Scaffold this motif. Structure first.
Motif, PDB file in Angstrom:
ATOM      1  N   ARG A  70     -12.551 -12.299  -1.879  1.00  0.00           N
ATOM      2  CA  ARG A  70     -13.571 -11.130  -1.374  1.00  0.00           C
ATOM      3  C   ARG A  70     -14.681 -10.843  -2.266  1.00  0.00           C
ATOM      4  NH1 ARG A  70      -7.855  -9.757  -1.454  1.00  0.00           N
ATOM      5  NH2 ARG A  70      -6.743  -9.214   0.483  1.00  0.00           N
ATOM      6  N   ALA A  71     -15.660 -10.538  -1.651  1.00  0.00           N
ATOM      7  CA  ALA A  71     -16.909 -10.134  -2.076  1.00  0.00           C
ATOM      8  C   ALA A  71     -16.667  -8.868  -3.033  1.00  0.00           C
ATOM      9  CB  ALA A  71     -18.250 -10.234  -1.241  1.00  0.00           C
TER      10      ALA A  71
ATOM     11  N   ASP B 239     -11.729  -4.768  11.633  1.00  0.00           N
ATOM     12  CA  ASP B 239     -11.527  -3.649  10.613  1.00  0.00           C
ATOM     13  C   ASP B 239     -12.948  -3.298  10.019  1.00  0.00           C
ATOM     14  OD1 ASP B 239     -12.032  -6.183   9.224  1.00  0.00           O
ATOM     15  OD2 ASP B 239     -10.602  -5.552   7.755  1.00  0.00           O
TER      16      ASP B 239
ATOM     17  N   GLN C 159     -13.837  -7.657   1.368  1.00  0.00           N
ATOM     18  CA  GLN C 159     -14.530  -6.867   0.451  1.00  0.00           C
ATOM     19  C   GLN C 159     -13.493  -6.162  -0.430  1.00  0.00           C
ATOM     20  OE1 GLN C 159     -17.895  -7.205   0.767  1.00  0.00           O
ATOM     21  NE2 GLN C 159     -17.618  -8.316   2.486  1.00  0.00           N
ATOM     22  N   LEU C 160     -13.921  -6.411  -1.853  1.00  0.00           N
ATOM     23  CA  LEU C 160     -12.656  -5.879  -2.730  1.00  0.00           C
ATOM     24  C   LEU C 160     -12.693  -4.332  -2.739  1.00  0.00           C
ATOM     25  CD1 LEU C 160     -10.463  -6.816  -4.684  1.00  0.00           C
ATOM     26  CD2 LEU C 160     -12.153  -7.168  -6.460  1.00  0.00           C
ATOM     27  N   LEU C 161     -14.135  -3.870  -3.003  1.00  0.00           N
ATOM     28  CA  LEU C 161     -14.330  -2.655  -3.303  1.00  0.00           C
ATOM     29  C   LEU C 161     -15.493  -2.207  -2.563  1.00  0.00           C
ATOM     30  CD1 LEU C 161     -14.063  -3.150  -7.077  1.00  0.00           C
ATOM     31  CD2 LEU C 161     -12.982  -1.242  -5.894  1.00  0.00           C
TER      32      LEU C 161
ATOM     33  N   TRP D 256     -16.846   1.975   9.394  1.00  0.00           N
ATOM     34  CA  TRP D 256     -15.257   1.998  10.215  1.00  0.00           C
ATOM     35  C   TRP D 256     -15.176   3.372  10.804  1.00  0.00           C
ATOM     36  CZ3 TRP D 256     -12.674  -1.177  12.891  1.00  0.00           C
ATOM     37  CH2 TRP D 256     -11.669  -0.731  13.499  1.00  0.00           C
TER      38      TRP D 256
ATOM     39  N   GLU E  65     -10.964   4.972   1.835  1.00  0.00           N
ATOM     40  CA  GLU E  65     -11.337   4.036   0.816  1.00  0.00           C
ATOM     41  C   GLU E  65     -10.906   2.654   1.261  1.00  0.00           C
ATOM     42  OE1 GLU E  65      -8.869   5.797  -2.213  1.00  0.00           O
ATOM     43  OE2 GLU E  65     -10.366   7.629  -2.654  1.00  0.00           O
ATOM     44  N   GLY E  66      -9.945   2.468   2.006  1.00  0.00           N
ATOM     45  CA  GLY E  66      -9.402   1.192   2.173  1.00  0.00           C
ATOM     46  C   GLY E  66     -10.222   0.492   3.501  1.00  0.00           C
ATOM     47  N   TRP E  67     -10.694   1.052   4.099  1.00  0.00           N
ATOM     48  CA  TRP E  67     -11.559   0.816   5.273  1.00  0.00           C
ATOM     49  C   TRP E  67     -13.278   1.024   5.421  1.00  0.00           C
ATOM     50  CZ3 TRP E  67      -6.731   0.873   5.043  1.00  0.00           C
ATOM     51  CH2 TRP E  67      -6.005  -0.089   5.245  1.00  0.00           C
TER      52      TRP E  67
ATOM     53  N   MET F 105       0.768  -1.081   0.027  1.00  0.00           N
ATOM     54  CA  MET F 105       0.143   0.045  -0.051  1.00  0.00           C
ATOM     55  C   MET F 105       0.783   1.248   0.099  1.00  0.00           C
ATOM     56  SD  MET F 105      -1.436   0.046   3.804  1.00  0.00           S
ATOM     57  CE  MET F 105      -1.258  -2.102   3.895  1.00  0.00           C
TER      58      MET F 105
ATOM     59  N   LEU G 214      -7.092   8.013   1.615  1.00  0.00           N
ATOM     60  CA  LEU G 214      -6.849   6.405   1.352  1.00  0.00           C
ATOM     61  C   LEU G 214      -7.502   5.434   2.339  1.00  0.00           C
ATOM     62  CD1 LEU G 214      -3.375   7.167   0.249  1.00  0.00           C
ATOM     63  CD2 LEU G 214      -4.799   6.094  -1.259  1.00  0.00           C
TER      64      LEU G 214
ATOM     65  N   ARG H  16     -15.145   0.194   2.449  1.00  0.00           N
ATOM     66  CA  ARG H  16     -15.291  -1.332   2.146  1.00  0.00           C
ATOM     67  C   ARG H  16     -15.944  -2.150   3.044  1.00  0.00           C
ATOM     68  NH1 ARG H  16      -9.557  -0.798  -1.428  1.00  0.00           N
ATOM     69  NH2 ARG H  16      -8.862  -2.755  -0.880  1.00  0.00           N
TER      70      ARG H  16
ATOM     71  N   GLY I 272     -15.023  -5.544   8.707  1.00  0.00           N
ATOM     72  CA  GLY I 272     -14.968  -6.485   7.681  1.00  0.00           C
ATOM     73  C   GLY I 272     -14.341  -6.023   6.432  1.00  0.00           C
TER      74      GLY I 272
ATOM     75  N   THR J  78     -16.824  -8.825  10.550  1.00  0.00           N
ATOM     76  CA  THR J  78     -18.125  -9.347   9.533  1.00  0.00           C
ATOM     77  C   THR J  78     -17.419  -9.859   8.275  1.00  0.00           C
ATOM     78  OG1 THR J  78     -20.133  -9.135   8.896  1.00  0.00           O
ATOM     79  CG2 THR J  78     -18.413  -6.980   8.535  1.00  0.00           C
TER      80      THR J  78
ATOM     81  N   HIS K 269     -11.387  -6.061   5.176  1.00  0.00           N
ATOM     82  CA  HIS K 269     -10.608  -7.101   4.523  1.00  0.00           C
ATOM     83  C   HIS K 269     -11.064  -8.331   3.699  1.00  0.00           C
ATOM     84  CE1 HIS K 269     -10.145 -10.856   6.678  1.00  0.00           C
ATOM     85  NE2 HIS K 269     -10.896  -9.957   7.327  1.00  0.00           N
TER      86      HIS K 269
END
Ligand SMILES: NC(=O)c1ccc[n+]([C@@H]2O[C@H](COP(=O)([O-])OP(=O)(O)OC[C@H]3O[C@@H](n4cnc5c(N)ncnc54)[C@H](O)[C@@H]3O)[C@@H](O)[C@H]2O)c1
Ligand SMILES: NC(=O)c1ccc[n+]([C@@H]2O[C@H](COP(=O)([O-])OP(=O)(O)OC[C@H]3O[C@@H](n4cnc5c(N)ncnc54)[C@H](O)[C@@H]3O)[C@@H](O)[C@H]2O)c1
Ligand SMILES: NC(=O)c1ccc[n+]([C@@H]2O[C@H](COP(=O)([O-])OP(=O)(O)OC[C@H]3O[C@@H](n4cnc5c(N)ncnc54)[C@H](O)[C@@H]3O)[C@@H](O)[C@H]2O)c1
Ligand SMILES: NC(=O)c1ccc[n+]([C@@H]2O[C@H](COP(=O)([O-])OP(=O)(O)OC[C@H]3O[C@@H](n4cnc5c(N)ncnc54)[C@H](O)[C@@H]3O)[C@@H](O)[C@H]2O)c1
Ligand SMILES: N#Cc1ccccc1Oc1ccc(Cn2cc(C3CCCC3)nn2)cc1O
Ligand SMILES: N#Cc1ccccc1Oc1ccc(Cn2cc(C3CCCC3)nn2)cc1O
Ligand SMILES: N#Cc1ccccc1Oc1ccc(Cn2cc(C3CCCC3)nn2)cc1O
Ligand SMILES: N#Cc1ccccc1Oc1ccc(Cn2cc(C3CCCC3)nn2)cc1O
Lengths: 265, 260, 268, 268
Positions: C152-153, B252, B258-260, B221, B211-213, B154, B208, B216, B254, D253, B256
């Motif tokens: 990942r979803a 986090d 989820q891609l986007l 968060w 966007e990352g946390w 990252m 950033l 997603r 969740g 989650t 991590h």
């Protein structure tokens, strides 16, 4: 037509003719590559070993802890390959851990000075070599390092496992830098191969346990089996990555382990 | 009845009242734990900060690069908790990286001396603390360290990412040692929390991180709320994850997964 | 000369000349492979498309839901390649999900009959094809399937994500079976490529979210990839598949190679 | 006092008092939870079994393949918990695979009809239960399913491995939906526990190799686990599920918690 016809590739890490780097170099020459070799510490021995390769290749000294070696490396490579030529490939096949960091020595008794030396040579140096050599790499080039799957703990490998975890993380950052030059960076996570470093791990009394664990972890799990005395599959895999045939893979790890890591038992 | 009723837990890493360790300590005391605290370098400041915890706790000096501090640690804990008592829990909430290893400094320009210092404090020390303290831990105990997901590279995190990868590997070996004592070892991979260390690594940084946390995370968060992280650490210190070791729990939102 | 000189390779999944399979086939022929092609349902269309390949190749019908097609497949391949010859390679480049399982349709409203059809075609069929064809594969052979990283979803991909997770698991079991024949099994997890199936995810190139699809694809892939990613260029994917069909990844099986510009290695 | 004081939790999957769901339910009641239980097919047997729980709990019929059961489930739960009350927790502890999909039956001989049924019950149903019950879940609630680590292939588990891979993917999409309700969705990847499914179903499909089963499980789990693993003790698993149902994992989650003694973190 060889797979690496006309490519100029630097290969580090030859110490004996069992070295993974020796086989990487042999196969790369069989496939038409022009090599530059680097060696550490026992240069006269290493020269004798590199004479057993199919073709001649210049040998340059490189101690990856030595700042001066790293600062002069590109100039010395350029002089070996001819001014105006650049490298297409770089192979990092290098590692070290002091004896306190491996084998039956308790994990908590390795001092950090020893662990640090190990991480310097085994992980940080992947970044240092890339830093030194990217300025003399062509677009489309490939940097490849050697990994041993550190995703799970295991007996004996100890702090070298930690160093490999570090290396995997470094490889992903090297890929970010290398991408600016149109260059790929990847690791090959090899199955076990009988080399000098392998014998250094228990280095003793438990050699039998090492072989048993290796047979259980690899050949027994591998759907196509695994032969620790045959480096060729690993060398070929590294050559695949050095080739133009994995052009969209970077920051990544290719497993050349007979599929062992995909099987629980 | 608190989650950690009657447990004796050592907590390292308080420097300010935003510190993840401060909130871990607060929640652990709310849940009935008796704490011992360790602090590095600014002991007088840290004492003022730990006065804001719900209950009194002894504060011991611990610089994880100092061999003598580590060699005397167990004896100094034993003296704080009373002879014949042992720890049930140890929290490692500690990290460091020199400025060269982070932020906008190019990745290749960090000298190894700097990276090494960072790895010593941020990764190796997890093993050092476990070595010092396992001999005074009860069976059923729990060692917990703080992680930040280093599985992918990252921007900015740079060599600290490398240190976290090392820490994850160290945790798996600590688990092997700790298991001999009936002790669990795990990391909590937390989402981003506004702390002193975070400011050491600011609009692009927050964008950033969002966007990352938060973007997603299916439950969102909040970087200003350390409580979910502290609770997660307390879950691991509790008896309620008795079959989890060598492992990483993600606190986090969740993100991590989820891609986007 | 070629990477696949003298190899006999079956390639499934050509429907148009944007199909990942079409490019796999093109590159394989450029590298000296002799192909057998299989096609589903629109055989006359597919024949017109395969005429645009560099070389002639026989085209055989295969609907992976049809038990009779699978039972006769090996015999019909043998007849195309000549008795006494075997395959060196098999490419599975096949997928399907009903519209209820993808796009903006809510995830919970896909009926299981639809999801099941999708899993049958997209995951189970990898096992079916391997079962049919391993008996006519040479030692040293290679089976390759196409994956899209389902770890990942994500928006839209929905139940196809589930099917890909299934496929990854199937691939590891196929590797166990294939190993007995000296045959490797692997998937290529490709970055996004503009194909007919891609446009079907949002219900067409005109689908309501097509704009959001391209934006998400650019954010997930090209923006993360250290070497970038071009969704209009299937060649890097085809080459990667050809690497796996070659002798140059001889110790890799049950595995996943990422041909995605390195996107999956980078957070942002 | 209890970890789950005042929570209303639905628990599916009790068939015997070895059932992981039985121990989840026992522990949850010991921790103050008010339960609603669901059972499949053998309702009279299940009622006798649930009488052995520390407290009384209503038992509702649920066959996750039955559309009518799913459509009426929320109303029947509401009637058990009182109108205007909602659930805080849902436990999915449900699985099925036909014998053709497991054991020594060859992997390639399992017909898709059998695999599909397996995936329906073991994976898709996680989505179906969440769909039915999220409308009656409070913010801060928790849905938990049972997993067995399918990241690597293994002997015998075969197509159930594929189903678990699918379930992990489903869980990540359920998390996306559940998040809109302030609800968490996670799986617990348990080590092996002696249950009816383990012994009769997986054991049965092993046929003349049933005796291998314990040896393989000891090699994969207890031998790897730094704190060991006891297959006859479901409590560590039950506690782990209760941790997730509690307020003490509030930022987790779409995820998988491993209650396996740390086995999956160790190579050998
Ligand atoms: N052999 C295996 O089973 C196996 C499996 C996976 C990965 N690997 C990795 O492959 C690489 C090559 O190891 P190998 O097994 O061929 O061993 P080897 O002993 O043949 O080679 C190790 C090399 O490291 C070099 N080296 C050590 N310190 C150095 C320094 N300061 N500067 C420069 N070079 C230095 C040595 O000079 C030697 O050439 C290493 O990264 C090793 O960890 C080996
Ligand atoms: N804040 C976040 O977003 C976040 C997220 C995930 C993980 N983490 C991790 O959480 C942990 C705590 O960080 P934080 O965010 O609470 O920051 P913080 O600045 O509040 O605390 C970091 C602590 O490290 C201590 N430390 C530094 N060098 C040390 C030494 N030599 N000896 C002992 N302790 C030493 C400092 O005294 C300080 O108490 C670190 O491991 C950090 O990487 C932080
Ligand atoms: N295009 C992408 O972005 C992308 C990325 C990664 C993976 N993939 C995978 O690549 C593979 C091919 O996809 P594509 O993008 O080339 O699609 P495409 O639409 O060109 O072709 C998909 C093919 O599936 C075949 N197929 C469908 N149902 C079938 C059946 N019942 N029996 C046999 N064949 C059947 C169709 O005939 C068609 O040829 C799929 O597995 C897809 O999931 C695609
Ligand atoms: N026992 C183990 O080693 C182990 C390990 C990890 C995960 N698991 C998982 O834990 C869960 C519980 O299994 P278990 O081992 O307690 O076995 P079990 O036999 O006690 O329970 C399985 C349950 O599935 C139910 N079920 C099957 N078909 C159903 C349907 N149509 N509708 C509703 N319920 C249905 C059965 O009635 C039964 O209550 C499953 O998801 C299983 O895969 C088991
Ligand atoms: N170069 C180098 C190097 C330096 C320190 C330790 C090992 C090194 O090279 C390796 C040599 C051999 C292996 C494979 N391996 C692992 C083991 C351990 C004992 C059984 C499990 C781990 N034995 N052989 C892996 C390696 O990284
Ligand atoms: N203690 C400590 C510490 C030392 C060096 C670097 C970071 C440290 O703690 C953290 C503080 C904050 C975070 C989360 N974080 C990462 C970042 C980078 C900015 C762009 C994304 C990653 N910003 N905040 C993670 C941490 O490990
Ligand atoms: N064959 C086939 C197939 C069948 C159903 C769904 C997709 C299919 O092929 C693909 C086509 C395209 C992709 C890549 N992809 C992902 C997506 C998006 C996920 C983020 C937004 C939609 N858009 N294109 C992946 C594929 O498996
Ligand atoms: N419910 C259910 C269920 C239905 C079909 C198959 C298994 C089911 O539950 C399980 C029962 C047991 C396990 C653990 N397990 C795996 C095995 C295989 C034998 C060699 C190791 C894999 N034996 N026990 C995992 C499970 O999901």
């Amino acid at each position: 037509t060889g797979l690496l016809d006309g490519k100029r590739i630097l290969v580090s890490g030859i110490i004996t003719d069992s070295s993974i780097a020796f086989h990487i170099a042999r196969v790369a020459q069989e496939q038409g590559a022009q090599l530059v070799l680097t060696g550490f510490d026992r240069l006269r021995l290493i020269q004798r070993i590199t004479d057993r390769l199919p073709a001649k290749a210049p040998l340059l000294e490189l101690d990856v802890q030595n700042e001066e070696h790293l600062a002069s490396l590109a100039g010395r490579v350029t002089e070996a390959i001819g001014a105006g030529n650049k490298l297409d490939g770089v192979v990092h096949s290098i590692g070290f851990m002091p004896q306190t960091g491996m084998g039956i020595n308790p994990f908590f008794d390795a001092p950090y000075a020893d662990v640090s030396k190990g991480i310097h040579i085994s992980a940080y140096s992947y970044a240092s070599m890339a830093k030194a050599l990217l300025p003399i790499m062509n677009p489309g080039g490939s940097i490849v390092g050697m990994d041993f799957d550190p995703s799970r703990a295991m007996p004996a490998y100890n702090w070298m496992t930690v160093a490999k975890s570090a290396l995997e993380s470094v490889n992903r950052f090297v890929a970010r830098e290398a991408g600016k030059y149109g260059v790929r960076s990847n690791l090959v996570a090899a199955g076990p191969i009988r080399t000098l470093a392998m014998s250094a791990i228990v280095g003793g009394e438990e050699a039998g346990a090492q072989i048993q664990l290796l047979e259980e972890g690899w050949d027994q799990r591998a759907p196509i089996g695994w032969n620790m005395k045959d480096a060729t599959p690993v060398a070929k895999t590294v050559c695949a990555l050095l080739s133009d045939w994995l052009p969209a893979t970077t920051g990544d790890i290719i497993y050349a382990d007979g599929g062992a890591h995909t099987q629980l038992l």
